[PDB]
Amino acid sequence: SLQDPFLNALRRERVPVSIYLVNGIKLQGQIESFDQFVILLKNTVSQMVYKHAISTVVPSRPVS
Amino acid sequence: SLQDPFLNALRRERVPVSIYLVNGIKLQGQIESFDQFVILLKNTVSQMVYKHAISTVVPSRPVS
Amino acid sequence: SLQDPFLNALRRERVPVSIYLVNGIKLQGQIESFDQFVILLKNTVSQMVYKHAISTVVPSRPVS
C-alpha cells in the first residue's frame, strides 16, 4: 500500500493538509492519526473523516 | 480500528456532535449507539444514519 | 447488527418514516419489508429503495 507511507509522513511532520471531500467541501488541519477506514483531522477539535468520503489529500508544502 | 474508540467517547460522554453527510447536509445531536454499518443519532427522535453516507463526525467540544 | 432491530420496529409498528437519500431527496411512507441490500417503502405503490443510496432513516414519532 502507498496510503500508509503517505499519510504517515503528513502525520509525522505535522504537515498542514487540505482534505477535499467527495462533494467539493474543503477541510483543513493536521492529521492526528489514521486507520484504513478513517482519518482524524485536528483543528479546534478532533473530527472523524471517513476515507470513503475523501476525494484527495493535499499537503500544503512538499513532503519527503 | 479507531472508529470504535472515537465513537465510544462521544457516546459515553454524551457529547453533542455535528455529522455532515456526503451531500453537505448537516445533522446535529447525540450518538445514542453505533455498529459498524450505522450510527443512531438522537434529537426529538432516534434516526438511523448510514456510515457510508457520512463524510465526517465533528464533536462540539474537545473530547478525551 | 442494529439495523435489523431498528427497521423491524418501524416495520412492526407501521411507523411513518422519512428516508432521505444521498442526494437530499426525501421519501416518505411505511417500511413494508427489508433485507440487507434494500428497503421496500409503501405509499400508493411499493418502491424499492437501495440502502446504499440511503443517508438516514427518520421515524416520525418516538419508537420503542
Next chain:
Amino acid sequence: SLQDPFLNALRRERVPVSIYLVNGIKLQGQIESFDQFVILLKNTVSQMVYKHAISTVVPSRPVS
C-alpha cells in the same frame, strides 16, 4: 434476498417503472433483464443501468 423477487415481477408483468439515479436523474421504461450488478432498461434502445447508481425503483402501478 428481496431484490430478485421484486425485479422479477416488474420484468415478468412488463410493468413500466421509474428508476431514479443517485443524482436525481429519472429514467423510465421496462426492465428487460437483471443480474446482481446491473439492470437493463428498455425504451427505444436497451441501456445498461448500474445498480450501485440506483437510488430507488418505482413501479408505475401496484404489482403483486
Next chain:
Amino acid sequence: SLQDPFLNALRRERVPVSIYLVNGIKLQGQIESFDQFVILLKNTVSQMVYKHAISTVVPSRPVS
C-alpha cells in the same frame, strides 16, 4: 453476469455509446476494451472510465 455480454457487443460492433456518470456528466465514444473495474472509451484519446462512477451505458442504436 450480463455486463460482459452487453459490453462485448458494444465493443465488437463498435457501437457509439453515451456513458452517463454518477454526476450527470455525459461521455460519448466507442468502447475500446473493458475489465470488471474499468471501461476504456475512445474519442481523440483513450480515457479510463471507472465503472463505479458510471450510472448507465446507453447505446446509440439497437444492438443485437
Next chain:
Amino acid sequence: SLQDPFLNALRRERVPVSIYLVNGIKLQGQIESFDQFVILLKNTVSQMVYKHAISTVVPSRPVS
C-alpha cells in the same frame, strides 16, 4: 486487470493527465505512482487521489 497497464503508461511516459472526480472537479498533472486504492498526482506538491472518488482518467495526448 487493465488499470495497471493503463496507469503504468501514463506514469512511465510522464504523460500529463486530467483526472475528473465524481463531483466534476478537474485535476491536472502527472501520475507519480499508484496502488489499487490511490493515485498520487504531481504538480506543485504530491496529492493523494482516492480511486473511489475518480470518475475517469484522461490522457492529454495519445498513449501507446
